[PDB]
Every structure is written in structure tokens, then in C-alpha cells.
Design a protein around this ligand. Structure first.
Ligand SMILES: [Mg+2]
Ligand SMILES: [Mg+2]
Ligand SMILES: [Mg+2]
Ligand SMILES: [Mg+2]
Ligand SMILES: [Mg+2]
Ligand SMILES: [Mg+2]
Ligand SMILES: [Mg+2]
Ligand SMILES: [Mg+2]
Ligand SMILES: [Mg+2]
Ligand SMILES: [Mg+2]
Ligand SMILES: [Mg+2]
Ligand SMILES: [Mg+2]
Ligand SMILES: [Mg+2]
Ligand SMILES: [Mg+2]
Ligand SMILES: [Mg+2]
Ligand SMILES: [Mg+2]
Ligand SMILES: [Mg+2]
Ligand SMILES: [Mg+2]
Ligand SMILES: [Mg+2]
Ligand SMILES: [Mg+2]
Ligand SMILES: [Mg+2]
Ligand SMILES: [Mg+2]
Ligand SMILES: [Mg+2]
Ligand SMILES: [Mg+2]
Ligand SMILES: [Mg+2]
Ligand SMILES: [Mg+2]
Ligand SMILES: [Mg+2]
Ligand SMILES: [Mg+2]
Ligand SMILES: [Mg+2]
Ligand SMILES: [Mg+2]
Ligand SMILES: [Mg+2]
Ligand SMILES: [Mg+2]
Ligand SMILES: [Mg+2]
Ligand SMILES: [Mg+2]
Ligand SMILES: [Mg+2]
Ligand SMILES: [Mg+2]
Ligand SMILES: [Mg+2]
Ligand SMILES: [Mg+2]
Ligand SMILES: [Mg+2]
Ligand SMILES: [Mg+2]
Ligand SMILES: [Mg+2]
Ligand SMILES: [Mg+2]
Ligand SMILES: [Mg+2]
Ligand SMILES: [Mg+2]
Ligand SMILES: [Mg+2]
Ligand SMILES: [Mg+2]
Ligand SMILES: [Mg+2]
Ligand SMILES: [Mg+2]
Ligand SMILES: [Mg+2]
Ligand SMILES: [Mg+2]
Ligand SMILES: [Mg+2]
Ligand SMILES: [Mg+2]
Ligand SMILES: [Mg+2]
Ligand SMILES: [Mg+2]
Ligand SMILES: [Mg+2]
Ligand SMILES: [Mg+2]
Ligand SMILES: [Mg+2]
Ligand SMILES: [Mg+2]
Ligand SMILES: [Mg+2]
Ligand SMILES: [Mg+2]
Ligand SMILES: [Mg+2]
Ligand SMILES: [Mg+2]
Ligand SMILES: [Mg+2]
Ligand SMILES: [Mg+2]
Ligand SMILES: [Mg+2]
Ligand SMILES: [Mg+2]
Ligand SMILES: [Mg+2]
Ligand SMILES: [Mg+2]
Ligand SMILES: [Mg+2]
Ligand SMILES: [Mg+2]
Ligand SMILES: [Mg+2]
Ligand SMILES: [Mg+2]
Ligand SMILES: [Mg+2]
Ligand SMILES: [Mg+2]
Ligand SMILES: [Mg+2]
Ligand SMILES: [Mg+2]
Ligand SMILES: [Mg+2]
Ligand SMILES: [Mg+2]
Ligand SMILES: [Mg+2]
Ligand SMILES: [Mg+2]
Ligand SMILES: [Mg+2]
Ligand SMILES: [Mg+2]
Lengths: 246, 61, 92
RNA sequence: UUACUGUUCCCUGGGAUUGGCUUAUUCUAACCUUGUGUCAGGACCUACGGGCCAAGGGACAUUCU
RNA sequence: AGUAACGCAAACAUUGGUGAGAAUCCAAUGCCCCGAAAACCUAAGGGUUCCUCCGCAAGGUUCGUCCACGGAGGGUGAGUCAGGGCCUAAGAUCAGGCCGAAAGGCGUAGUCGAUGGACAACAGGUGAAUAUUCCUGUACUACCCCUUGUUGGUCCCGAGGGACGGAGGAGGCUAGGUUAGCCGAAAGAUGGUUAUCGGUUCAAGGACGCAAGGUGACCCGGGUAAGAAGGGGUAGAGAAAAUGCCUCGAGCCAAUGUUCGAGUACCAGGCGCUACGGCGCUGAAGUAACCGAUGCCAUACUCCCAGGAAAAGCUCGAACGACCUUCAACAAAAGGGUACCUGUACCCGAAACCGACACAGGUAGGUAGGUAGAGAAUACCUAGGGGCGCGAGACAACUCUCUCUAAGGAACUCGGCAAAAUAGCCCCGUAACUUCGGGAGAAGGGGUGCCCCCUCACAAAGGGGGUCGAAGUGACCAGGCCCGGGCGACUGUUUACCAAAAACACAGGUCUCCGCAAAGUCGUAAGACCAUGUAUGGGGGCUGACGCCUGCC
RNA sequence: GUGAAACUAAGUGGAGGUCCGAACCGACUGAUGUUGAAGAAUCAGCGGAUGAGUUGUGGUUAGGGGUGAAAUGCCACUCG
RNA sequence: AUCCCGUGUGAAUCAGCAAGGACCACCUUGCAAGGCUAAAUACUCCUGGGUGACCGAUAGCGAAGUAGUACCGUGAGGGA
RNA sequence: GAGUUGAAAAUAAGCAGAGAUCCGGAGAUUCCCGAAUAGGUCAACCUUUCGAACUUCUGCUGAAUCCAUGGGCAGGCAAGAGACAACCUGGCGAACUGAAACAUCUUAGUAGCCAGAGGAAAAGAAAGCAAAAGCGAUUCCCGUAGUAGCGGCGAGCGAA
């Protein structure tokens, strides 16, 4: 319970200047922040699951952990988890769901999530609901694996990760029945640029329902909206990429 | 039950107006320090119209 | 040990008030009316009357006029008598 | 706007920042990134940060011309 | 041009008085209006408009002896109300630090910052103008003194706690209301009559304690072993806390209630005085039943997804570190004593704020009576406040706001614009079509008052009989309906001041970009948002529920 | 009801960008006013009225800009 | 050319270097990459004195009286 | 050097040839806000341990880290801060306009903003002008001269 707090970055979408950078953010119901442990430190101790709580700040559920020393933590909810299951973070830990260990000690073809790219920062990849990363192979310094996007990235071997697939896979199946359910999440109505005036969007003017009237569809800031790859050329992580998603 | 178009002054509290037009607000920025320089050379009696103390009969609380 | 503010203790009491209501208050409440400095307090006024006339002060109540002049109701203990002290000054 | 002349974002080459051994690939020492790793005053910095030690990149890139 | 108008169609009228002078000022009587306000408080704001005396130049849309006007003087009393001396959110500043022609920008701790949290009072009386502020009575908070005991404490630090949503309805109470009873008074020129009129009231707080209410393991009432609230002990990095283990414990929860406070206090009425103001004595009864909250128990319970602030006060407790000390410090009961700053007037559904006006307007929140009624709608009334700041006559056209209008009934008209009609409750009966939810109150018909009985009133409804009227939800209040087609799916949003739509949005669908030091966006830069998120996610373009489909280059 | 389910009748429950309708927020039609009582109001009806609701207090975004369920609309009766 | 900067390169020391309007030669002149320095000069919110073919209350400073007052505006500000 | 207690009479009391009132020089006090600077703040107020905050100066002590740095303590009417019409210096740096349009150009290195400083500032004691003859720091005025030149060789600009 003490891991929950109300100290959050109020004023979503607004930067320090106070101008809207990330549009269509506002309203929505209030939500407290949960402290989830992604590093999975405090190794070589058993901890059992008791609750499966609701986290408004994400798509997946969480799980409360109770260790023998009295500490309490939050983690993501794997798929086939049930109350009473144990979890361990270590090196010689057996390879089953809920446990955490580096990629060196894992076999090939494992369902993995909560992957970290660097040591200490904690897991960053494969957090969403129903997310999973398949380990393809490993060779010497680093280890390649597949991501939910279908891309094959080359991650270091000493990085930690959690086994299994994230819970509540069946969340896309429900369709938001009406617009009010969208505003409850904090997503304001999206206006189309073709309806605007020319000063506001390049597609604006023209009597009637105007077509694009341009060589290509464009963003509100002039650049095209389709096909142009936005990845920075000669990026630091360019050698760690094996292929492109699909 | 709709206010007319010309009601731009809805009798807001003087506490907030001092925080927006008060003496301490002008002395913070460089422009406000020059603002008072213009009103003193002008010779105006009341330099800041929208100002009130923290206590006394003028206090908004 | 410090007072609240620092100023002339002998300026705390400018002059009394002479009205038909004030004189009526002396006999009913055993009180006295005095105009006081704006920077004055109930402690300094309580200590003041204890030293000038050598009498006890049951309670002190004050207020600031619209003109920025402070007034002070001073109720003496029942042992003394404000009417007797009034004649010592000259006012009835 | 496929009017004229220009500016900016962005891409690319030469030069500086910028170095070593090999036949373009490697190496670590500049430089980039990170630490809930550690030390620190009267005290705290698990509050940014500083010093130290490590980890991942690496003379590419960022920056200037 | 002495022309228009003098700011609602709530309504004035008489007597008497004041005075040089009165439709306009004062009083009395009667009439009429508001009465979820046109009533009483109160926040912001205004800033002396409040009270008394004097005056009437100007101001008041008339008058004026009056006034929110003018002059003079006076008036706002707090340990408990509100705010500060306590805390913090949004947000604003920011030691150092980073960035930058300058100004300066970003930003860490920290500090400011109520619209929140925390914290101690009521009744009655006094009255030119103030009182939960003054007086009386009864309480509370903090500090100090005193008396014993303890004899290391106080900060830092650790932990607990504070600490929270919406919707829904049930139950137990009270406020409040009605009636009855009791007490007192009354003849209100009428046919009769007392069946009429009035009163029947009291808080904060202290002390006690609760179900037939809610909760707490065990059965179809009994039995029984763990088990609730609430405590204790123990192990490990290990004081508290947390986690695990063991153990005691049938009672717990709190609005209400009882009693004191609470006196012949308050009070109808009566006896006398008067300059008619009130004063001075006297002062009975002071109970019960029914109805019953939108308020209390109550972040009590149930359900649901959108998943519902922080800090301090408070409580528990070791070590390290800091300060101080044998009382000079901590802690317990009684008693006694002591008690900072500012606001407090007056208006506040307005003539004093906001609208240039004494403007048919706008202005958060609290209190919420009686009859009928589902109701805070509506109609008439109580408390209380008002009669709208020019009037008197006359009763042409014409205009506006309203009522009825023979026969006909949309022939009017761009157009059934406007007006008229419908209307409630209880029964009967309800189509095509459909996404099976709807359509639907479909449509369309019958009944409706009062009195007696059935009937035991079973809170009702129903049945039978009788009776009045042209007319029974008789007033106010209170749906018009049906067939067909186009657009858009629908609830919603939009050009404040000529356009509410077929436009926008919408759930959904599709394409494309982004592997986190992310894309994108704002910045000279540092950096910020995106995100304390991680491809079931984020940004962007088009389309716009659903159903059948979405071709060729 | 079945082998178990599917399915199905009652009762309980009280959901909804649900219905009628005051306050509150809005402003569709018409009349009146149009040197107005009023620089957008009065009167009579009308729409939503547990929600994408309304509102107070205290704040944020400032012009080669901001904001915009997007009208070139709003940003102190002033906005291509 | 002379003078002053960003980027990148990079000399010489009197037998020398720079300048003399691309540059070379000869001659002349001068000695950069350190610094300070009065006077003649420009201005009037003001002070004292003096003088006006300057105004005389719609003039002259906005202002001959409580003028940057009254008044208007959220404010900057405008302004009798 | 004879009457006085402002404008500003009146009233009530004083001072004064033992030389007042008044006029000058040097001093004292100088409440609150304000650079504001004990802390906070809605300027003229609040809370307070009662303090010129911060930077600088003079000392003491001496983190990571040996020397050091950064902190901490104390002293010290204690240097600096802010204000200031115009002129002056430096930095940023327009547009309408003119060219009968307009971009090179002009308006213009003007306006305005920021910063700083003085009564003046800035400049300034030849790595200079000049041309075969000579001058001997800088600045200002006359004049050279609207000349030599620059310029979509256009408008216009303009030396020594
Ligand atoms: Mg449009
Ligand atoms: Mg465009
Ligand atoms: Mg177009
Ligand atoms: Mg077309
Ligand atoms: Mg309203
Ligand atoms: Mg007071
Ligand atoms: Mg470190
Ligand atoms: Mg750190
Ligand atoms: Mg005429
Ligand atoms: Mg006429
Ligand atoms: Mg008129
Ligand atoms: Mg007339
Ligand atoms: Mg009526
Ligand atoms: Mg009055
Ligand atoms: Mg008159
Ligand atoms: Mg008159
Ligand atoms: Mg008056
Ligand atoms: Mg209080
Ligand atoms: Mg700083
Ligand atoms: Mg901060
Ligand atoms: Mg604070
Ligand atoms: Mg508050
Ligand atoms: Mg308090
Ligand atoms: Mg009153
Ligand atoms: Mg808690
Ligand atoms: Mg009779
Ligand atoms: Mg323990
Ligand atoms: Mg009062
Ligand atoms: Mg009052
Ligand atoms: Mg109101
Ligand atoms: Mg009104
Ligand atoms: Mg008006
Ligand atoms: Mg009623
Ligand atoms: Mg009504
Ligand atoms: Mg009535
Ligand atoms: Mg009248
Ligand atoms: Mg009137
Ligand atoms: Mg009238
Ligand atoms: Mg007819
Ligand atoms: Mg016809
Ligand atoms: Mg016809
Ligand atoms: Mg109609
Ligand atoms: Mg009708
Ligand atoms: Mg029907
Ligand atoms: Mg139909
Ligand atoms: Mg109706
Ligand atoms: Mg047609
Ligand atoms: Mg629609
Ligand atoms: Mg609609
Ligand atoms: Mg319109
Ligand atoms: Mg509409
Ligand atoms: Mg319209
Ligand atoms: Mg629209
Ligand atoms: Mg990025
Ligand atoms: Mg469309
Ligand atoms: Mg609805
Ligand atoms: Mg409705
Ligand atoms: Mg609207
Ligand atoms: Mg209406
Ligand atoms: Mg309605
Ligand atoms: Mg309707
Ligand atoms: Mg509807
Ligand atoms: Mg601004
Ligand atoms: Mg501009
Ligand atoms: Mg406007
Ligand atoms: Mg040269
Ligand atoms: Mg030459
Ligand atoms: Mg030379
Ligand atoms: Mg003049
Ligand atoms: Mg004249
Ligand atoms: Mg200060
Ligand atoms: Mg300060
Ligand atoms: Mg000094
Ligand atoms: Mg200065
Ligand atoms: Mg130009
Ligand atoms: Mg031109
Ligand atoms: Mg021209
Ligand atoms: Mg000077
Ligand atoms: Mg001089
Ligand atoms: Mg000079
Ligand atoms: Mg000089
Ligand atoms: Mg110099």
C-alpha cells in the first residue's frame, strides 16, 4: 500500500513553457502512481503472490509480492499466474515463469519479457499486455532476440529479463462502446486537418469536402505523413540491429 | 442566466490582482522596474493601482 | 523576554475618550476608554496601566477605527473602581 | 503554388575536435551514454549534482567551420 | 418643443399629525403583492453608504418638511468565530549547478502558496448604531505554578496513522410538522354556536449506556474447536513496523437516548402607572400519539470501471550523529492562576458589488414552514418584507399585451408562421419494421365528483347502490398524433452579437512512422513534454456505428 | 432440461453518454423592442438535465504567438 | 590595398619586419602584436546672474487654483 | 538686530536688548515601505533566536582528496549593489519610406531595447601622412568640395 503515491507530473501534454507538445491529452479520471520494480534486485529470496491489482498507468495488471524479510514490491502480471506462485531473481534460478535472470543462463527459444537494454536502468522492453520476446540465439559478447514488433535486435548477454508472457491478453477484444469511455482515459477529440483552414493545416481550404490537393499527405508541420522513415541515420544503436520490423 | 458581453470585470478578489499587478510583481522583472521609472517621471501619485496590504481594512481575507 | 515591537511606552496612551456612552460604561462595566497607538498591544497596555495608576487590569479589548486610529477598552478588576480613578484624573 | 529570389529543418563530403597496431577490420586513451554502485562536510544528496570505481559504445557520432 | 418620454399591467385608499407649503414625509386602520422570495444570514467586492441632530443650493427623471444627497458629531470590543503565528497541492520562485549577445532561461533540495488538512463555546440578557466579541450562568484549549514519582531527556532518524471515487437503495434515529390532551382567555351587535383564540419552550458540555438497528466462526432451536472488535508473545539483517508462527478474547460499532446543565429561567394571561414608551409586580400548564426528512449513524453495506491528493499535527520506537542537563528535564491526577496580530459597522436574489444611470439584467454558498400536490413544479397563505420615485382625468383612430367570436374549417400563406386543440392517474388494447435492445405513453378506446354499504378497510384497489351539474385530473399545472422520403448512425460540440445544420466530433476501420538516449513537438542552447509510458504502446493522414462490399490503371 | 453443458421460466438486483420534468447550464421558433428598460434583453413555448454535466476559488498557456469536439471562431464590448 | 573578426594553417628579430591602393624590384617612411593621460569638443532634470522686434489664460511647459489632479481603462497607458 | 510662535486670521498660553523670531557654516536625530539586505510577504505589514542578506576584505577551523577546493565559525558605521533629463561608450539591431514597382541599394548602423560610466566620455604619443619637397600624438571648426571617386554607373552616397 505504501508503494502508491499521488506525486505525479500534473498537466499532461504541457511542457515547462506550458504549451501543448503532445496534443489530445487532458481530462480523464484521476489516478495514483504505483511503484513497480523493473530492476528485480534483492536476489536469492523467495516471494509469493497474494493480489492481482489494477494499474491505471498501463495496459497490464500487477502482482503484490511478500518476501520473508517483510519487504513488499510490485511486478507485472504474467499470463498463467495464480495466487501462491513464487518468484525469484538470480543466476541459477530455474527457468520458469515469473523468475528473473540474465540472458546467459537461459536456453534458446524462451518466452521473455521485461527486458533491460543496460545494467541498472531496469527493464524497458516488453512491458505491455500480452507482450513477449523470443530469444533466437546468442554468440559471444551479445545475444540476439525477437521483439513484439517482429524486429530482431542485438542485446547484451548480461542484461536481466523476466520469463513468460504478460497478463490480460484479451483486452483488445472489448471495443469502446462510445466516446465517453475515451474521454475517461484522457484522450480528447481528434480533428482532421482537411476540415481546418489553410493557416492551420496544409489540407485546409476548399469548398465542400476537399481532397488532399497536394503531391502527398502532409503533417501539420509540413513534412509528409506516409513512407518517410523517421529513424536517425548513423545512430549509436545502428550496429545492434539485425533487420527491420515487418 | 447569461452575463452580458461587456462584463469583463466580475469583481475578482484583490488578493489575486495584487499577485498579477502588484508592486512586488513589477519589481521582479526588468520591464516592471522600467514601468515604475516611467510613472515616476510622469509624476503619477498612485504608482500601482492594483495593490493591497497583507493586513488591515484593505485585506481581502 | 522581547516585546513584539519597540517604541515609546509613554506614547501607548494618548488620551482618554469623553462621551455620554463612555461615561455610561464606567459605572456599568467598571471600564475605561483610551485612544492608543496603532502599533500597541494588549500586553503593553496591560503592563502600562499597572504602572501609571497602580491598578489591576481584568481584561483588555481593542479595535482599529476606519481612520487608522486604535481604541482600547480596559476593564479593571472589581476590587478597584474606575469611577474613583476617573475623579483622580478630572473626568467624570 | 511546378511564380522569382532566399532562409530553416534534414541528408552528404573536406577540415578541426582525433589516436594506436594490423590487412578496410580491430584495440583504448580523447569523446558520448549509464549506475537504487561507492565516498563526501554539522547533516543529507534513493534530491539534481560532485569525486572515485565499474559497465556499454568508440575514434564513428555529437559540436564548430 | 414645452413635443416624445418620466424605466413593467403587485394597487392603492382614508383619517389625523408635522410644517410657510404635502397624492409623494410620519403614524393608525383597511385593501393588495412576494413568500425555493420581492424573506433572514454570509463570501468576494464596494469602502462609512451604518446611527443621532441640523439643513434642503445642487443630486432624485414630479413633489419633498424625506433620502444610499450636504454639514456636524458618534459608531465596528473575541484564548474558543474567520485568517496568520502549523502543514502542504496546482502553480510560482530557487541556494548552489547547467545553458545563454544582454535582459535572462532551464532546474535540485528548500521556501512561499486555500479553494483542502490540522486546531478549543453555548444559551439567555442588555440595546440610538456592536456582541458566539460586552454582562450573567455553565464549559472547553494551551501554558505556568503547586504536590509526589521517574530519574536522562530534546532534535535528527525509522515506522504506523492521517488517507480520501462514483452509483444505488434498505434500515435505525432526530430535526421539523400535524393532531390530541392540559392550562388560560374569549361573546367578535346576525339563524345557530364555543365547534373559537393563544401558550404548551430551552443549547454547548459533563457523566452513564444501548437494540427488536448493523457487524461477528460454528445447524435446522440446541451443541461446538478454531474464529470479530481489540490485545499479548516469539524467530530471522530485526527497537517499533513489516512478514511468518503461536496465544488470549463473545462480544464489538454510534447517530439517538437517560441524567445533570435547568432556573418557578423563559412564557400566555392578569394586576397598576404613565410623557404610551414600556416599566413594576404576578405568572398557570410546559405532556402524548401519528407523519417524517434531500439531515445524522455513514469513506455502514452492495455493485461497477474510468480505479478514486499531498504534508503536518498525533502515536510507537532502537542504533549512529547533534544539543542540553539532578531537575534546571520527562511523565500522571486534582486544585489554582494566566491568556498575541488582523477582520468584525452597513448593503449583498442589491438603489451601496458587476452593467457609464437609483438600468425590467448578471452575481458562489447556507437556512427550507402550512393546505392541495409525486414534488424545492403550480395556486392561495404564515413568519418577515413590500405596494415597484411622476400623477389626475377622459374612454377616438391606430399600435402593442390578453379574452370570446355566429356558419364554414387551411379556402390564408413561400410554408398550418402564429394561434387553437391534446394533457393527469387507474384499467382494456397496442401494427409494419428490427441490430431482438426497441418501436411504445405506439396508435386507439373506457372510467374519473360527492354520500352510504360491502369491509375487518387489508396503506390500497375493487364491487354494489344512491345523488348534483351543460361540464368531475371541472382552476393553475399538465404529450397532439399518423403514413412516406432525403441527409447524418445515435448522446453530444460549433460561428459570444443575423447561420445549431446535411458541418464538426464520435465508437470502429485502414495506411504509414517509432526498439526507448524512440519517433514527433517546443526551444539559440541547456533541456522539457511524449513518459516516470515501452509496439495489445505512442505520433500522424484519411474514412466515420452496424450490415453487404470496396473493382481496373 | 442434459451424461455434463448449451438452452430455458420465475424472483432478486437497480445498469444506462436511458425516459418525462424543476433548479442549473443552454438559446430552436415567433412576437415585442429596434434615438429600446437593456450596446442581444423581455414575454410565450422549446433542448439537455448522472453526464463528453454544471459551477466557485486559486492558477497555467501571450501575438511570425496561444487556444480551438475546427467557425478563421475566441484571446478585456476590439481579431484574416 | 589599408583596418577588424569566425574556421584551418602558420613566420621572421635590425644582415629584420610592416606600410606607401593587386603584385615584383629599388628608394623613402615607420617600428605592430602591453598600458595610462589634461585642454580645445557635445548635452541640460537643474543652479546664479543677465538679455528678449518671445506668449499674455483657445496663447505660453499638459498644468498661472489640491495637474499628471479629476475622469476613463484589468493593465500598460491616456488625459481635461 | 526688534518684535515673534508657517501658509492663515482667530483662540489659549509662551519666548524676547541677560539680544528671541529670522539668516549662513559645521553637526545630531531621521518612525514604515522602497537597492531593502534577520526570515516571510498581496509595497508602507506579519513572524522573530533581534540579525547590514549575498559577493569582496581580515582571521579561525580544515569533506570526498596528501597539498587544495568546497563548507563551517567569528570579526569588521564594511568596499560593492540602486537611483540618475540629455550628451557619451559598448552589444543586439528594424520597418514604413526613396528608387515614382521591386530583391542589389537607400531609409540606417537611424529608431528602440539591454548594459556601463563620467562631468564630460571616447580617441590619443606613428609598425603614421607624404612623394624626391617636407610634416611630426589625439580632438574640434573653416576650407579643400559636393571636387577625386563609389553606384541595377539607377536612385542616391561621398573622401583625403
Ligand atoms: Mg470550415
Ligand atoms: Mg500552408
Ligand atoms: Mg486543400
Ligand atoms: Mg467539390
Ligand atoms: Mg448562475
Ligand atoms: Mg479584535
Ligand atoms: Mg556517484
Ligand atoms: Mg546520487
Ligand atoms: Mg411635433
Ligand atoms: Mg402628441
Ligand atoms: Mg425611452
Ligand atoms: Mg406622452
Ligand atoms: Mg401573483
Ligand atoms: Mg441613514
Ligand atoms: Mg433643492
Ligand atoms: Mg425636484
Ligand atoms: Mg448623510
Ligand atoms: Mg477556529
Ligand atoms: Mg544562482
Ligand atoms: Mg523545486
Ligand atoms: Mg511550507
Ligand atoms: Mg480555507
Ligand atoms: Mg489558528
Ligand atoms: Mg445591525
Ligand atoms: Mg496509509
Ligand atoms: Mg354570531
Ligand atoms: Mg522486532
Ligand atoms: Mg459584529
Ligand atoms: Mg453584522
Ligand atoms: Mg445568490
Ligand atoms: Mg437584480
Ligand atoms: Mg449599459
Ligand atoms: Mg411548501
Ligand atoms: Mg413558485
Ligand atoms: Mg399571493
Ligand atoms: Mg407610489
Ligand atoms: Mg426607482
Ligand atoms: Mg417608476
Ligand atoms: Mg368562428
Ligand atoms: Mg391564395
Ligand atoms: Mg393554398
Ligand atoms: Mg407552431
Ligand atoms: Mg396554445
Ligand atoms: Mg395512450
Ligand atoms: Mg410510429
Ligand atoms: Mg408543456
Ligand atoms: Mg428531391
Ligand atoms: Mg447528428
Ligand atoms: Mg442533438
Ligand atoms: Mg450567431
Ligand atoms: Mg440543435
Ligand atoms: Mg441561431
Ligand atoms: Mg462545426
Ligand atoms: Mg526524443
Ligand atoms: Mg466525413
Ligand atoms: Mg438522459
Ligand atoms: Mg428532460
Ligand atoms: Mg454556446
Ligand atoms: Mg424563455
Ligand atoms: Mg425546460
Ligand atoms: Mg421533448
Ligand atoms: Mg432526448
Ligand atoms: Mg505577456
Ligand atoms: Mg508586435
Ligand atoms: Mg471580442
Ligand atoms: Mg598587409
Ligand atoms: Mg605603389
Ligand atoms: Mg610609415
Ligand atoms: Mg493652457
Ligand atoms: Mg480675454
Ligand atoms: Mg526584509
Ligand atoms: Mg527580498
Ligand atoms: Mg560602502
Ligand atoms: Mg548600477
Ligand atoms: Mg525595405
Ligand atoms: Mg518605392
Ligand atoms: Mg512610389
Ligand atoms: Mg553621474
Ligand atoms: Mg568643469
Ligand atoms: Mg571640456
Ligand atoms: Mg578618457
Ligand atoms: Mg584610453
Amino acid at each position: 500500500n505504501n508503494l502508491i503515491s499521488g506525486q505525479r507530473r500534473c498537466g499532461k501534454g504541457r511542457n515547462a513553457r506550458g504549451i501543448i507538445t503532445a496534443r489530445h491529452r487532458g481530462g480523464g479520471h484521476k489516478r495514483l502512481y504505483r511503484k513497480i520494480d523493473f530492476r528485480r534486485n534483492e536476489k536469492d529470496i523467495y516471494g509469493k503472490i497474494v493480489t492481482i491489482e489494477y494499474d491505471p498507468n498501463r495496459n497490464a495488471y500487477i502482482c503484490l509480492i511478500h518476501y520473508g524479510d517483510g519487504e513488499k514490491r510490485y511486478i507485472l502480471h504474467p499470463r498463467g499466474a495464480i495466487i501462491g506462485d513464487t518468484i525469484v531473481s538470480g543466476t541459477e534460478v530455474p527457468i520458469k515463469m515469473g523468475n528473473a535472470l540474465p540472458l546467459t543462463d537461459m536456453p534458446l527459444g524462451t518466452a521473455i519479457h521485461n527486458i533491460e537494454i543496460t545494467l541498472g536502468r531496469g527493464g524497458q522492453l516488453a512491458r505491455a499486455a500480452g507482450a513477449v520476446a523470443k530469444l533466437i540465439a546468442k554468440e559471444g559478447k551479445s545475444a540476439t532476440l525477437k521483439l513484439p514488433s517482429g524486429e530482431v535486435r542485438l542485446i547484451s548477454k548480461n542484461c536481466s529479463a523476466t520469463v513468460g508472457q504478460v497478463g490480460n491478453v484479451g483486452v483488445n477484444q472489448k471495443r469502446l462502446g462510445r466516446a465517453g469511455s475515451k474521454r475517461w482515459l484522457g484522450k480528447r477529440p481528434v480533428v482532421r486537418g482537411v476540415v481546418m483552414n489553410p493557416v492551420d493545416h496544409p489540407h485546409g481550404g476548399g469548398e465542400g469536402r476537399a481532397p488532399i490537393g497536394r503531391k502527398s499527405p502532409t503533417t501539420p508541420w509540413g513534412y509528409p505523413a506516409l513512407g518517410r522513415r523517421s529513424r536517425k541515420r548513423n545512430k549509436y544503436s545502428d550496429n545492434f540491429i539485425i533487420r527491420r520490423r515487418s | 442566466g447569461k452575463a452580458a458581453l461587456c462584463l469583463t470585470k466580475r469583481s475578482r478578489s484583490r488578493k489575486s490582482l495584487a499577485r498579477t499587478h502588484g508592486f512586488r510583481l513589477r519589481m521582479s522583472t526588468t520591464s516592471g522596474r522600467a514601468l515604475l521609472k516611467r510613472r515616476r517621471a510622469k509624476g503619477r501619485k498612485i504608482l500601482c493601482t492594483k495593490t493591497n496590504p497583507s493586513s488591515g481594512k484593505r485585506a481581502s481575507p | 523576554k522581547y516585546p513584539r515591537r519597540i517604541l515609546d511606552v509613554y506614547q501607548i496612551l494618548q488620551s482618554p475618550i469623553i462621551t455620554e456612552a463612555a461615561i455610561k460604561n464606567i459605572a456599568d462595566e467598571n471600564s475605561l476608554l483610551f485612544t492608543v497607538d496603532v502599533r500597541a498591544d494588549k500586553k503593553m497596555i496591560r503592563e502600562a496601566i499597572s504602572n501609571f495608576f497602580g491598578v489591576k487590569v481584568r481584561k483588555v479589548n481593542t479595535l482599529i477605527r476606519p481612520d487608522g486610529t486604535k481604541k482600547a477598552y480596559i476593564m479593571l478588576n472589581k476590587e478597584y473602581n474606575a469611577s474613583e480613578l476617573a475623579k483622580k484624573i478630572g473626568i467624570f
